[PDB]
Amino acid sequence: KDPNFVHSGHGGAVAGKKNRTWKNLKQILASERALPWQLNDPNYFSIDAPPSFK
DNA sequence: ATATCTGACACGTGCCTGGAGACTAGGGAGTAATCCCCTTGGCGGTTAAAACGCGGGGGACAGCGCGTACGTGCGTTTAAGCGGTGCTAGAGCTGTCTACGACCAATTGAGCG
Are the C-beta atoms of A33 and A26 separated by less than 8 Å? Predict the structure, then answer.
């Protein structure tokens, strides 16, 4: 039977003009910028490859 | 044969078009102050988006018949020149008044309380 019969409200709402989905990726890599990041970090903004040099 | 003609062939001055010089002074170009703008970007009441089951009617015939085409008849159409002669623009000139200049009032936008 069901792995659970009741479930949490993880961030999506029951009702409103608000989502049922959580924040999409474009809002995540925006809102994550407010944190105390440093020059040595595994920061997901920094991993996208550079432009082609030739 | 001859009179005298039609180029040869040029500088006369007219007209206006058209250029460059030296001036004022109108206005364009350089700039901050600063505001307020085009713009970036999350929010949820509202409609783009596509099935299923279905209503409105698109679709292809047969053939009736109120109009449509040809293209010649025949008498009515405009053409056509060139008479007179009033209109018509040129154009020469006012004789002002009318719209555009020079001096300064009612009404507005800006400042913030």
Answer: no
Resolution in A: 3.3
Experimental technique for the deposited model:
cryo-EM
> Amino acid identity, residue A42?
P
CA A31, chain centre distance (Å): 8
Contact call for residues A30 and A18 (beta carbons, < 8 A): no
Footprint of strand B on the protein (CB under 7 A): A 16-19, 23, 26-27, 30
Report the distance separating Cα A20 and Cα A23, nearest Å. Answer: 9
